[PDB]
Design a protein around this ligand. Structure first.
Ligand SMILES: *[C@@H]1O[C@H](CO)[C@@H](O[C@@H]2O[C@H](CO)[C@@H](O[C@@H]3O[C@H](CO[C@H]4O[C@H](CO[C@H]5O[C@H](CO)[C@@H](O)[C@H](O)[C@@H]5O)[C@@H](O)[C@H](O[C@H]5O[C@H](CO)[C@@H](O)[C@H](O)[C@@H]5O[C@H]5O[C@H](CO)[C@@H](O)[C@H](O)[C@@H]5O)[C@@H]4O)[C@@H](O)[C@H](O[C@H]4O[C@H](CO)[C@@H](O)[C@H](O)[C@@H]4O)[C@@H]3O)[C@H](O)[C@H]2NC(C)=O)[C@H](O)[C@H]1NC(C)=O
Ligand code: NAG
Ligand code: CU
Lengths: 199, 73, 337, 210, 54
């Protein structure tokens, strides 16, 4: 019998996993959700419609202790791939969207690691509201933004934070938009000067 | 000389072609560098490969002197 | 008359579409991927997006979906809704603004060997680095990078069905000719993981533009305006038509600029060759107007000097027109030739 | 459908020996092979399915292995209870069975006790004239029998049967018959039965006249 | 969340989201309506149409 089948029966049916309930020991705890954003392409900026269209990959990470297992008890399965409809999600949305598309476009699998970390990298096409400043046009620069928050959970139930990377065993927060230094095709009309992130 | 190469899957140790004498390892970030770490390319070269601005290259003349970052010589 | 219902019930009673369809979890699912290109719907140089109609044939063996045909009256194949079964999550990595994955969940054809063929239709809007320098005689190498989004090469392996995309059903395009096509499988290594490769199949198509439309609608008007701007120097000063002629040509070029800016892509990545020719024509008209003013003022001061200047400048202007036209078009024509 | 062959057709083995039986298909059987044991007068019992999986309650002596078109069943240490016919079959494309392997107990060689009997006059009064030739307690079962009448060999009307291994001595007993009419019998006078068996370089002969 | 799960399971036992919560037959459900304007997206005088995010 496939060890994945046994492990999934264990996690979801045997332990009775409820995706409706937050992964907390006590209701007063908030789940830390870490976000990073990878900009795949800057599709367009339309000044007449004041709309920024971007292709992005939103790297979610959080801990769900209900999804822990010992790999040696399940044939050294260290990572598991699940439909996002099965697990509890923090339900993050693009707040400043321009067209009513609040949620992510493609519901890809979540990766659940044996130590309980849930990693998700949904790709999405977003059309955000970017108010244009026309003063110096054409030599203008625009300060667009993407604002992510949860409407289903408040700041008491889940905590937003930036992803931390590490070098020389010293951690630091990733305070900027991730861009591929070689695969990123630049937009035909716009150059990215700065790309900070703030909580 | 014998060097590591990524031309095979998995990484394998291969005797270089005649004339080529330097093992090399090249690395750079890609769209997945945030979670997968740097790309790693291992191989044999007669001359140390040119560096694109984002690339990191290390060249050496010892057998198996260019291990994967998780391995050791 | 009831055995196919029995077969489907027996197959899916305990099926799970979450686990990979292998006997042992350490095995790799081997998926064969074949891109069929039905139609090149659109190319957008301004947003650098290529829109294509495709059939994404995927073939793999589901270990749990075997049956014995003699148990079911010799039924050797059935049709199943693809939402029921496990599927590889192929994603278009270089999606511009379309769907990342398949969204038309057609039926799969399932054979008694467990072999599944799934041929979903898709519309792909891939991101392509359009090169506009040689426009309109340009060739574009545009690509479609496909791969499993969440499975890595140690759990799902994808293999190209053939060296080339299937163009047998390709509807011929009215503006681009596919010069060649080719799929290459790539395996990449990362510093996290010495053991697990990441696999993708990049299909690519070299499309050549048919330039005739842009030759007709753009090149000829500019050539005519250049010719008139040259001819204005043979016109006598005493006619009085000189200034009217040059002003009318400038106005006509400015009006046609409203067409040019619609036809030429607004990409600031590089100046299009046709855009360079347009700017050359504009500068030539401007210089012709300035020189006409200078000559008119000279003649009213010297008449023979002005006439000799007119005769020299006529040849100069016509030679500059022909030289510019050749330097613009001949290089790209020779490259294509 | 997949054709299956088994080897060896008979396998003489001794108690406690390891023994291996081979099954080979015409096509890939994809490990959908099963082995079952049958004794005389007994319900068949499944031993192995899916090439490896022991049937519940089967002794650990049996183990299966194989791939592609070639598969084997192994008994690590032959018990006396394991002497039987073993069938492989496949269940992936149709259902097809091998001819069976008759695993049988090893036995010391024995020469056949050959004898011949004419049709008695009580039979001749009825018009039947079946001659009979017997070969008792021979081993191995490899044996050949020939009927000769007035020196000429005969094949028409010849029949034969062989017992199974004796429950006490594991030898075999064989009978052979030659049915004839009274006229055909009286047309000849010399009769002989010739027996070829591995225990002798020359055949044994038993004969009668008048 | 044991207590939240148990309370949530309690409340929806026999609940029917299609039936309005009037206790007596003549009772009316009072609904307060408020509006927060997040963005006046546009006004179009050709379609006589105002687009808002609220
Ligand atoms: C339009 O644009 C597109 C962009 O999409 C252009 O596409 C590019 O087209 C090129 C050819 O025109 C392709 O190059 C060729 O790629 C082949 C595939 O390479 C990958 O697989 C290799 C292993 O595959 C073998 O085994 C499988 C198994 O069956 C077979 O099916 C295959 O055919 C092969 O036999 C693997 O080795 C490669 O990885 C190596 O290279 C990459 C960089 O390319 C490194 O990152 C890897 O680490 C690795 O490097 C190792 O190997 C090299 C030597 O190759 C060493 O120097 C390194 O140190 C290290 O050890 C890939 O994963 C290649 O097989 C093929 O090789 C030919 O050429 C090389 C020299 O260039 C010779 O050494 C070989 O002998 C052979 O002749 C070649 O590279 C591009 O892949 C393709 N790119 C993309 C992104 O699609 C297209 O051409 C454009 N068209 C126009 C403009 O008209
Ligand atoms: C898991 O990994 C360990 C260490 O490599 C190995 O000994 C063991 O056999 C593997 N299998 C299981 C089922 O634990
Ligand atoms: Cu039927």
């Amino acid at each position: 019998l496939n060890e994945e089948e046994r492990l999934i029966r264990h996690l979801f049916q045997e332990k009775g996993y409820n995706k409706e309930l937050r992964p907390v020991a006590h209701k007063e705890e908030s789940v830390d959700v870490a976000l990073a954003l990878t900009l795949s392409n800057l599709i367009s900026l339309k000044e007449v419609e004041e709309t920024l269209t971007t292709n992005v990959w939103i790297e979610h990470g959080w801990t769900d202790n209900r999804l822990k297992w010992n790999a040696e008890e399940f044939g050294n399965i260290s990572v598991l791939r699940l439909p996002p409809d099965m697990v509890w999600l923090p339900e993050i949305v693009l707040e400043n969207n321009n067209d009513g598309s609040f949620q992510i476009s493609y519901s890809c699998n979540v990766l659940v690691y044996h130590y309980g970390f849930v990693y998700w990298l949904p790709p999405a096409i977003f059309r955000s509201s970017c108010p244009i400043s026309v003063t110096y046009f054409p030599f203008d620069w625009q300060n667009c933004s993407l604002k992510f928050s949860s409407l289903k959970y408040t700041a008491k139930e889940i905590t937003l934070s930036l992803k931390q990377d590490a070098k020389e065993n010293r951690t630091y927060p990733v305070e900027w938009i991730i861009i591929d230094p070689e695969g990123f095709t630049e937009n035909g009309e716009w150059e990215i000067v700065h790309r900070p992130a703030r909580v | 000389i014998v060097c590591h190469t990524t031309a095979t899957s998995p990484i394998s140790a291969v005797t270089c072609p005649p004339g080529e004498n330097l093992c090399y390892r090249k690395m750079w970030c890609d769209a997945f560098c945030s979670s997968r770490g740097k790309v790693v390319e291992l191989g044999c070269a007669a001359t140390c490969p040119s560096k694109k601005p984002y690339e990191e290259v290390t060249c050496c003349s010892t057998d198996k002197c260019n291990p994967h970052p998780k391995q050791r010589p | 008359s009831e055995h196919e219902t029995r077969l489907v019930a027996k197959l899916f009673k305990d099926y799970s579409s979450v686990v990979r369809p292998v006997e042992d979890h350490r095995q790799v699912v081997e998926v064969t991927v074949g891109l069929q290109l039905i139609q090149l719907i659109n190319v957008d140089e301004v947003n650098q997006i290529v829109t294509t109609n495709v059939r994404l044939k995927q073939q793999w063996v589901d270990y749990n979906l075997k049956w014995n045909p003699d148990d079911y009256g010799g039924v050797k194949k059935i049709h199943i809704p693809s939402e029921k079964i496990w599927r590889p999550d192929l994603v278009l990595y270089n999606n511009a603004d379309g769907d990342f994955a398949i969204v038309k969940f057609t039926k799969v054809l399932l054979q008694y060997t467990g072999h599944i063929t799934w041929t979903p239709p898709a519309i792909f809007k891939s991101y392509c680095e359009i090169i506009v320098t040689h426009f309109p005689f340009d060739e574009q190498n545009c690509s479609m990078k496909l791969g499993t989004w969440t499975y890595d090469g140690s759990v799902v392996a994808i293999n190209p069905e053939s060296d080339q995309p299937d163009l047998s059903n390709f509807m011929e395009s009215g503006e681009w000719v596919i010069k060649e096509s080719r799929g290459w499988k790539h395996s990449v290594t990362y510093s996290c993981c010495p053991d697990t490769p990441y696999l993708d199949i990049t299909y690519h198509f070299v499309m050549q533009r048919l330039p005739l439309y842009f030759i007709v609608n753009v090149i000829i008007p500019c050539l005519l305006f250049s010719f008139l701007t040259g001819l204005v120097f043979y016109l006598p000063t005493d006619s009085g038509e000189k200034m009217t002629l040059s002003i009318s040509v400038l106005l006509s070029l400015t009006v046609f600029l409203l067409v040019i800016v619609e036809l030429i892509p607004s990409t600031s990545s590089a100046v299009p060759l046709i855009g360079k020719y347009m700017l050359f024509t504009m500068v030539f008209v401007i210089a012709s107007i300035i020189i006409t003013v200078i000559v008119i003022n000279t003649h009213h001061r010297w008449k023979y000097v002005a006439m000799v200047m007119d005769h020299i400048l006529l040849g100069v202007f016509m030679l500059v027109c022909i030289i510019g036209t050749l330097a613009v078009f001949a290089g790209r024509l020779i490259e294509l030739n | 459908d997949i054709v299956i062959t088994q080897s060896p057709s008979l396998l003489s083995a001794s108690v406690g020996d390891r023994v291996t039986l081979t099954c080979k298909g015409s096509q890939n059987i994809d490990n959908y092979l099963a082995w079952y044991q049958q004794k005389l007068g007994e319900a068949p019992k499944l031993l192995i399915y899916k090439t490896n999986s022991l049937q519940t309650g089967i002794p650990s002596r049996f183990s299966g292995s194989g791939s592609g078109t070639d598969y084997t069943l192994t008994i690590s240490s032959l018990h006396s209870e394991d002497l039987a016919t073993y069938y492989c079959y496949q269940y992936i494309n149709g259902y097809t069975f091998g001819t069976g392997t008759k695993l049988e107990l090893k036995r010391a060689d024995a020469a056949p006790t050959v004898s011949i009997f004419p049709p008695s006059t009580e039979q001749l009064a009825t018009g039947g004239a079946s001659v009979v030739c017997l070969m008792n307690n021979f081993y191995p079962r490899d044996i050949s029998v020939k009927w000769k009448i007035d020196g000429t060999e005969r094949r028409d009307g010849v029949l034969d049967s062989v017992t199974d291994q004796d429950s006490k001595d594991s030898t075999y007993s064989m009978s052979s018959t030659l049915s004839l009419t009274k006229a055909d019998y009286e047309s000849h006078n010399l009769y002989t039965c010739e027996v070829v068996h591995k225990t002798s370089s020359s055949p044994v002969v038993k004969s009668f006249n008048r | 969340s044991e207590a939240e799960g148990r309370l949530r399971e309690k409340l929806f036992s026999g609940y029917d989201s299609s039936v309005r919560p009037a206790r007596e037959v003549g009772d009316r459900v009072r609904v307060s309506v408020g509006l927060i304007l997040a963005q006046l997206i546009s006004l179009n005088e050709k379609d006589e149409e105002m687009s808002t995010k609220v």
